[PDB]
Every structure is written in C-alpha cells, then in structure tokens.
Amino acid sequence: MLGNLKPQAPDKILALMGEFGKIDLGVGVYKDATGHTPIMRAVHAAEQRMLETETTKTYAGLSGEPEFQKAMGELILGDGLKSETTATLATVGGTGALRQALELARMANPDLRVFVSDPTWPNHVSIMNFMGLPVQTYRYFDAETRGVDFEGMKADLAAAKKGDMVLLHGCCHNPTGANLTLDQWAEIASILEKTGALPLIDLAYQGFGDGLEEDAAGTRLIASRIPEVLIAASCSKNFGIYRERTGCLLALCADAATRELAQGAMAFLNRQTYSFPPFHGAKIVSTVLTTPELRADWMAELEAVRSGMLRLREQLAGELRDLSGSDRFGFVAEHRGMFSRLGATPEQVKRIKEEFGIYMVGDSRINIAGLNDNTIPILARAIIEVGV
Amino acid sequence: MLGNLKPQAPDKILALMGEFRADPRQGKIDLGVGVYKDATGHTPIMRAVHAAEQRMLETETTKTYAGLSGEPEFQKAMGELILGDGLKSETTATLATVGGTGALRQALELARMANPDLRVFVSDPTWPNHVSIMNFMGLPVQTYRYFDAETRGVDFEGMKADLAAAKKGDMVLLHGCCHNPTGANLTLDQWAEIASILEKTGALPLIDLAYQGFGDGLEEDAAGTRLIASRIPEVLIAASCSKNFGIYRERTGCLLALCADAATRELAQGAMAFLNRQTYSFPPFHGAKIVSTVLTTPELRADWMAELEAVRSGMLRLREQLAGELRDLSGSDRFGFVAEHRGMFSRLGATPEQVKRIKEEFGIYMVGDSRINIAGLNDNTIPILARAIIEVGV
Ligand SMILES: *Cc1c(COP(=O)(O)O)cnc(C)c1O
Ligand SMILES: *Cc1c(COP(=O)(O)O)cnc(C)c1O
Ligand SMILES: Cc1ccc(CCC(=O)O)cc1
C-alpha cells in the first residue's frame, strides 16, 4: 500500500539550510553577533523555576491553560481584550494556529476562498493547497519601489465577498519586510466591513518591527472595527522558543453565544488532531508574562534585539549607498522586521550563492539578523558586483 | 460567519468530574480516572524524568528549529524500545508526533494518501477517541468482535470470523497491549493466528502501542507487536510516551512506518515529514528530548525501568487483592478475570443500570461502560468495590 505514496515537494526555506566563509541569510530565526540563536534570559529563568514548582505532568486543558490564554490575549489586544466574546486555543506553534484557523473557517463556511498577499509566506499556500481551499492573491509588494502597492491591494480586496477570508500579516511582512501604516490599516478595515470578508491575521513577529505595542496596533485597529476576527499568534520568535512549538488561535466574536460555539469547535479541533496541545512552551510564556520581574527583562532583551537589527539595516543601507553613490537601496532601511526582498533576479540569486557563497532565499529574501559589521561590506560587494 | 458553527459536544470527562465533585459524600470513590495515580492519589513525575529535565536545563544552549520529523536520537531510541534488535532501520520510517493521538491521526492520514478507498476495522469496543478521529476524517469504519461480555475475555472466534472480511488495502487497528477499555488481551499464540489472517487478507495492521510497560513488562508487552513486524512487510505503529514515561502533558508520541523496501521507506519518510509540516511544521521538542535522554543514559534508563516495574507490580498486586476479596465474598471464581486482565483498565461487565446503582448506593464512580482504573484502588477502597459489585448483582 505505502508504495503508492507520491513524492511530495519540500520546503524552499528549509531546503536552503540543508544546502548549507559561508554566510547564512535564509531561515527566519534571530541570530546574535556570534552567529548564535540564544535562549532569552527570562525564558531560562522561567524553565528553572518551572522545574522546581511543577509536581505533576498529568493531562491539562484541551484548549491550553487559562493563564496562557489570558496572557496571550492581553499581549496581543491590550485593553481591547473582551473576554466575553473571545475564544482562545493553545496550538502547536503559529503554523498549528494557522491550520486550526483554516479548519475552523471551513467548518463555518464550506465554500470559503482565501485571499493572500502577493507575495506571502510559502507555507501559507502549501497548507491551503493541502486542504484544497481556493487561493486568490491581492497585490501587495511594489517590485519597483520595494514598498507596498497599496493602490492595487485595495482594488483587489474590494473584490472579496461575504464568507471569503483575507490573510494579513499583523506586522513584519514575511518575505518582503514592506509594511502597512496605521492610516493604511484603517482603510483596509473599511474595505473589510464593506465586503463582509473575515480577516485572518498572522502575528508571528510582534516585537521585531517598531515595538511590542506598536506592532500590535494594526491588529487592534481591525479588532475594534470588525466584529469577527481570527488571529494566529506565534511565540516562536519573540520568545525565542522555536522548538517548543507554542502559539495560540484567537477567535474574536460578536456575542457570547457565538463565542461558546467557536470555543467548543476549537477544542474539538485539537481533540481530533492530537488530543492536548504541548504544555512546556506555553508555560514558559505565561510565567514570563505574569511575573513582573520576568516580563520586564524579556521586554528589555527583545528591545535590544529589535534595536540591534535596525542598526544593521541602516549600516547595510549605508554600505551600499557608498558603493554606488546612489541610494537605490534605501528601501532596506525603510523595511521593518527580519527580512527584506532585495529584488535581485533568480539568476542573480543563484550566482551570488554559487560564487560569493552567501545563501539567501530564491526570491532574494535576506535575514537581516544574519548580517554583522564584518559580513555587511562583503554582502554589499556581492550584490554590487552581481547587479545586472 | 462563525455563527454557523454546529455546536460540538464536550469531552465528557468534565461532566464525570462535575458529578463526582458535586457529590457531598464523605467516602466517594473515583475509578473513572484515566491516568495513573499513586497511593496518595497523585500522578508524580518519574525520577528519571525530573533528572533528564535538570540535565537539559544545564546543557541546552539554543532553542532554534530542530528536526521536522523529530530528532535522530529520539527516533532511534523509540524504535529500539519498541522493536528491539529486530529494528531494520533501512526500511523503518519514523515520525516524532504530538503524543500518541497525533501518531494515530498521522497514520490514518498517511494511509489515506496511499489508498483513498481505505476502510478501518476497530475492535468492539475500542478507545472511543479512535472512532471520533475517523468519523471526523470521514473514513469508513467497521467493527470486529473482541470483548466477551459473559467471560470478560477475548471472543477470539468472533474476532477471526469478522477480520476474515478485511480486504487488501483495509486497515486493521490492534492495541499492542493493555487493551483500553477492556483489559482483556491476546496471547502470543492468538497474535500468531492474527498475523496469518493479516497475511491472507493483505490488510495493513495499525498498532496502537500506548501502554508498553504496564502489562507484563517492557519486552513482554512488545511481544505481539514484534511478531506482527516479523510476519507482515508493511506495519504502522502509533506509540505513546505519555503513560509509561508519565509525561502526559508534554505530548510525546511516535509513528513508525515499517516498509517492504528502502525505496518505499523514503517515500513514507518524505510523506510523513510533509504531514507534520502541513499540520504544525515542527513537532514538540521538550518531551521527546526527555525520553531520548532517559533512554540513552544508562543510569537514567535503569532508574526508569525500575520505577515503571514497581508501578506495574503494584497494580498487579492490586488486581490480585480485588480478585481475592471478590472470591471470598462471592464463594466463586466468576470475577477471576480481574487478575487475568492486564493494564490499568478493566471493564467489569456491569450494565449502565448497575453502574448507576453502584454510584447511587455506594458513591463509587466509574465510566458508564463499567470501566475501572485499577490504580484508583487501595487497601481501603477494595473491600468497598467488592461489596458493591456483589450487592448490585453483577
Ligand atoms: C514564524 C512564522 C510562523 C509560525 O512559525 P511557528 O514556528 O509555527 O511558530 C507563521 N507565519 C509566519 C509568516 C512566520 O514567519
Ligand atoms: C493514552 C492512549 C493513547 C494516546 O495518548 P496520547 O496522550 O495522545 O499520547 C492512545 N491510545 C490509547 C488506547 C490510549 O490509552
Ligand atoms: C516550515 C517553516 C519554515 C520556516 C519557518 C521560519 C520562518 C521563515 O523562515 O519564513 C518556520 C517554519
């Protein structure tokens, strides 16, 4: 029987790491000056305390622990957290949240379509394909200005209708790094309510753009305007606990009734997929979040990280500027997040890795965190020499 | 849109605890628990497990993305734990999963990919959760006789007769050991016969191995599974570390795809990694790392096997006592099956009416199908349960 298994397609980003003075600028993970992905001080302190307070490992909650559910809700929505109309579901990372979100939506509407940004995280499309959900794209990245073709985005979105779902990146757009402003978000919200399309927000990098609260701004705008919203958050990057697999699905509803429905459906989704969600990572998160001392050190460390990266974008931009006398590469400093699409053609991308030895995703996606003071000029030299 | 959501039934477990907790009875007993509880009513963290966690806290330097299919050390240690020396790596595909339930879900998904017209045969009865997952997927589910309500043992003739109806490509789900909920198990000779039936029909066996170590012992509990692996070329094994490692909440499981050849193993391994990827990208690391650490570290593995063995023996002594108490009271050996059953669960064969009389008259709670948790018994509760069973005319 198993011999009938057709060969499946692998993941592009992960494939790179396998195919790796080498310079890694692929996989979206934060790395420090010494090319290491550290464990955050507070996270280490949390685990340490956990190892001393936990007396049992029995089965816990099917939708995650109340402490995790409450902390995550507050972290994301701040004061916009209306417990009476919000359903929470602890998941296996942000990807697990996205999948669960799609499963929930399809249950509610068997004939749902999904609008995704051109471009967007590859893994978004693969999952939808696997599920057999019709995917449509809305213009987003402006290839010339490397910014956002907001004009086109609004036009395409206006074509959405009731029952359809729109996937938005709350901040730090993967893979472009091009992001919407609060003014743009308000306009998107008016489009959404006019069309009746359910928004699904992918919140994977809250804290890597402009700050914890500022990065949640757009999400909070949509949440205060649209009566029904879905938010799939990840604690992988902002808490540095990638391998723990922890995230959560937030279902914002209009009334308590619908809320109890969704909460029930969500708990059922977990039960039918793997019974209980993993406890360890979720415990670290709630511990950090509910312990003043721990939250403070986490906020500080995350701040240091996001600040360092911003310095790197400006440094690289400058290097390139001086290497061409032209600030064409200025968009680099304007982008926000961990990535930036350079705009180099596929042929150039491959040429750079084969001769220069710097590995970046096929669509010219570079992980800014991968650079450093001594590798920056080298990268700049490479892009300059290759530029057709 | 979400208003359309059809209300989903709760876990039921909650309702059970709701009844019990509401009961104002001083001496109320709960044999409906589904986890192991020691003498003091606690589900402790095993010594080796707490040791592994201490060791991990000191040696871990990063938490970046690890393996999509799981870690090599974990996959190997689990394969050796379940298949022993009989582990043929060249044809064995492994997938770290979110607990045993995730392993089952993935096994069913993989099988459906290989054969769309898949039909699954489940025992009568089986872990309710099995059917739930299948109904959810929309897979054809067929039942095969198993529990003999009159003797409390295996209705083997019925099992064989029904299994004979399996076609090539169908999936037959077998509990490797410690049958949940019944407690009635197959002997190695019955496993041998089952293997023959499986060869004849060409049905793919899916083995649910969640209690290795709670029956007669670690190696002993894997006996039936190892026989199947030797006779049949394609075998799917869904393993759980929740109970025998006591890491229920960490969600640690394993899916082993035994294939007829290396080429087929590559396909299975790729399709499994793909399946993990399309569900949640990467599997949970913490619990798996605890497992591989306990297993690869001599000193730890030793203490673990020692602790598991003590638990196993403790439950066996519990069964003996109960069977004895019941023998003295009944003046017969009808309840002898209590000592023959293995695992932490045992279905007594009491009807829902009798189950209700037991709760109302004696304050003893158990699952509606008369399934009890042996671990919940003790020197003080045993005399009570015995008295109850007999007084209700079971
Ligand atoms: C990181 C990320 C996720 C989630 O990753 P998990 O490891 O599953 O937490 C989801 N979407 C995007 C765009 C991401 O970058
Ligand atoms: C416990 C159990 C499982 C799976 O447990 P997980 O908690 O998902 O690891 C599977 N089958 C049976 C019969 C079980 O008792
Ligand atoms: C499957 C997967 C791929 C990548 C990532 C990290 C985010 C990225 O590199 O785009 C997570 C999961």
GROMACS .gro file of C-alpha atoms in nm, chain A residues 1-5 8-11 14 27-29 37-39 43-44 47-48 51 54-60 62 92 95-96 99 103-105 107-109 121 123 126-127 130 162-163 198 228 230 236-237 240-245 251-253 258 261-262 264-265 268-269 271-280 284, chain B residues 1-11 34-35 37 43-45 49-50 53-54 57 60-66 68 98 101-102 105 109-111 113-115 118 127 129 132-133 136 169 204 234 236 242-243 246-251 257-259 264 267-268 271 274-275 277-286 290:
model
  156
    1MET     CA    1   0.000   0.000   0.000
    2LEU     CA    2   0.262   0.253   0.113
    3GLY     CA    3   0.433   0.210  -0.223
    4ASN     CA    4   0.161   0.426  -0.375
    5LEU     CA    5   0.287   0.733  -0.188
    8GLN     CA    6   0.599   1.538  -0.219
    9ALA     CA    7   0.752   1.883  -0.262
   10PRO     CA    8   0.996   2.000   0.012
   11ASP     CA    9   1.010   2.342   0.176
   14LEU     CA   10   1.427   2.473   0.495
   27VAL     CA   11   1.576   3.067   0.762
   28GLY     CA   12   1.389   3.328   0.963
   29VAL     CA   13   1.550   3.288   1.302
   37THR     CA   14   2.034   3.182   1.848
   38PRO     CA   15   2.042   3.238   2.227
   39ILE     CA   16   1.787   3.143   2.490
   43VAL     CA   17   1.292   3.209   2.935
   44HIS     CA   18   1.587   3.037   3.103
   47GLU     CA   19   1.225   2.697   3.297
   48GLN     CA   20   1.447   2.700   3.604
   51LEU     CA   21   1.150   2.263   3.717
   54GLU     CA   22   0.574   2.157   3.887
   55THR     CA   23   0.465   1.849   4.082
   56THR     CA   24   0.288   1.661   3.804
   57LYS     CA   25   0.263   1.624   3.427
   58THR     CA   26  -0.092   1.485   3.410
   59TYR     CA   27  -0.327   1.584   3.128
   60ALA     CA   28  -0.407   1.954   3.135
   62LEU     CA   29  -0.768   2.083   2.589
   92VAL     CA   30   0.146   2.370   1.828
   95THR     CA   31   0.168   2.717   1.198
   96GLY     CA   32  -0.060   2.499   1.410
   99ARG     CA   33  -0.401   2.535   1.019
  103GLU     CA   34  -1.014   2.423   0.970
  104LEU     CA   35  -1.245   2.636   1.186
  105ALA     CA   36  -1.333   2.868   0.899
  107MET     CA   37  -1.636   2.423   0.911
  108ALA     CA   38  -1.828   2.752   0.934
  109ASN     CA   39  -1.826   2.804   0.559
  121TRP     CA   40   0.487   3.302   0.340
  123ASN     CA   41   0.381   2.771   0.391
  126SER     CA   42   0.102   2.480   0.074
  127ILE     CA   43  -0.136   2.428   0.365
  130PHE     CA   44  -0.321   2.050   0.101
  162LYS     CA   45  -1.911   3.751   0.237
  163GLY     CA   46  -1.770   3.420   0.354
  198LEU     CA   47  -1.340   3.751   0.762
  228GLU     CA   48  -1.545   3.879   1.387
  230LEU     CA   49  -0.919   3.546   1.372
  236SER     CA   50   0.850   3.108   1.844
  237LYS     CA   51   1.042   3.421   1.750
  240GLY     CA   52   1.293   3.254   2.125
  241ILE     CA   53   1.134   2.914   2.195
  242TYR     CA   54   1.107   2.789   1.835
  243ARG     CA   55   1.148   2.414   1.906
  244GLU     CA   56   0.890   2.419   2.189
  245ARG     CA   57   0.605   2.469   1.943
  251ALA     CA   58  -1.139   3.390   1.774
  252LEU     CA   59  -1.297   3.733   1.819
  253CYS     CA   60  -1.676   3.700   1.813
  258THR     CA   61  -2.105   3.255   1.901
  261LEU     CA   62  -1.973   2.786   1.973
  262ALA     CA   63  -1.624   2.871   1.848
  264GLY     CA   64  -1.631   2.437   2.151
  265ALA     CA   65  -1.537   2.389   1.786
  268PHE     CA   66  -1.284   1.974   1.924
  269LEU     CA   67  -1.029   2.057   1.652
  271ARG     CA   68  -0.902   1.676   2.027
  272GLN     CA   69  -0.941   1.533   1.674
  273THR     CA   70  -0.585   1.627   1.574
  274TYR     CA   71  -0.365   1.536   1.872
  275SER     CA   72  -0.573   1.549   2.192
  276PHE     CA   73  -0.383   1.800   2.408
  277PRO     CA   74  -0.156   2.087   2.299
  278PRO     CA   75   0.208   2.080   2.424
  279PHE     CA   76   0.247   2.233   2.772
  280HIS     CA   77   0.614   2.333   2.820
  284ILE     CA   78   0.726   2.948   2.987
  389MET     CA   79  -1.976   3.358   0.972
  390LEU     CA   80  -1.881   3.174   1.291
  391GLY     CA   81  -2.246   3.167   1.397
  392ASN     CA   82  -2.292   2.879   1.154
  393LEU     CA   83  -2.064   2.660   1.367
  394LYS     CA   84  -2.252   2.347   1.471
  395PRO     CA   85  -2.216   2.303   1.849
  396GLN     CA   86  -1.958   2.038   1.931
  397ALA     CA   87  -2.011   1.802   2.223
  398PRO     CA   88  -1.773   1.845   2.521
  399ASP     CA   89  -1.507   1.592   2.626
  422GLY     CA   90  -0.782   0.780   3.307
  423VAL     CA   91  -0.429   0.839   3.435
  425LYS     CA   92  -0.240   0.775   4.045
  431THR     CA   93   0.033   1.139   3.931
  432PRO     CA   94   0.402   1.201   4.017
  433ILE     CA   95   0.683   1.298   3.785
  437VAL     CA   96   1.221   1.229   3.403
  438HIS     CA   97   1.296   1.502   3.659
  441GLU     CA   98   1.489   1.785   3.281
  442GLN     CA   99   1.760   1.906   3.520
  445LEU     CA  100   1.835   2.287   3.164
  448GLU     CA  101   2.077   2.323   2.628
  449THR     CA  102   2.229   2.630   2.464
  450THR     CA  103   1.971   2.710   2.195
  451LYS     CA  104   1.606   2.657   2.102
  452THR     CA  105   1.625   2.716   1.727
  453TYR     CA  106   1.421   2.500   1.491
  454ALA     CA  107   1.523   2.135   1.528
  456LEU     CA  108   1.090   1.840   1.110
  486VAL     CA  109   0.226   1.528   1.927
  489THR     CA  110  -0.313   1.063   1.934
  490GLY     CA  111  -0.113   1.267   1.688
  493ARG     CA  112  -0.404   1.088   1.323
  497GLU     CA  113  -0.365   1.050   0.702
  498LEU     CA  114  -0.066   0.868   0.553
  499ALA     CA  115  -0.274   0.557   0.479
  501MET     CA  116  -0.284   0.925   0.091
  502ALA     CA  117  -0.157   0.583  -0.017
  503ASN     CA  118  -0.506   0.435  -0.052
  506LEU     CA  119  -0.932   0.294   0.290
  515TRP     CA  120  -1.077   0.368   2.285
  517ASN     CA  121  -1.133   0.857   2.066
  520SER     CA  122  -1.408   1.010   1.680
  521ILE     CA  123  -1.097   1.082   1.474
  524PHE     CA  124  -1.412   1.337   1.172
  557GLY     CA  125  -0.580  -0.221   0.149
  592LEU     CA  126  -0.246  -0.323   0.674
  622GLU     CA  127   0.409  -0.315   0.598
  624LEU     CA  128   0.220   0.113   1.111
  630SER     CA  129   0.252   0.983   2.796
  631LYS     CA  130   0.185   0.697   3.039
  634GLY     CA  131   0.447   0.994   3.290
  635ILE     CA  132   0.479   1.297   3.062
  636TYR     CA  133   0.112   1.319   2.961
  637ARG     CA  134   0.104   1.698   2.906
  638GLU     CA  135   0.434   1.721   2.718
  639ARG     CA  136   0.268   1.543   2.421
  645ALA     CA  137   0.624   0.302   0.925
  646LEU     CA  138   0.768  -0.044   0.862
  647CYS     CA  139   0.810  -0.081   0.485
  652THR     CA  140   0.919   0.271  -0.010
  655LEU     CA  141   0.851   0.775   0.021
  656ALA     CA  142   0.692   0.709   0.360
  659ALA     CA  143   0.523   1.192   0.319
  662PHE     CA  144   0.532   1.660   0.478
  663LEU     CA  145   0.234   1.569   0.701
  665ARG     CA  146   0.479   2.028   0.804
  666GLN     CA  147   0.119   2.077   0.684
  667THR     CA  148  -0.022   2.048   1.035
  668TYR     CA  149   0.215   2.240   1.264
  669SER     CA  150   0.554   2.250   1.089
  670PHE     CA  151   0.770   2.103   1.368
  671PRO     CA  152   0.683   1.859   1.647
  672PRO     CA  153   0.721   1.938   2.024
  673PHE     CA  154   1.083   1.904   2.137
  674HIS     CA  155   1.084   1.907   2.519
  678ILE     CA  156   1.338   1.394   2.796
   0.00000   0.00000   0.00000
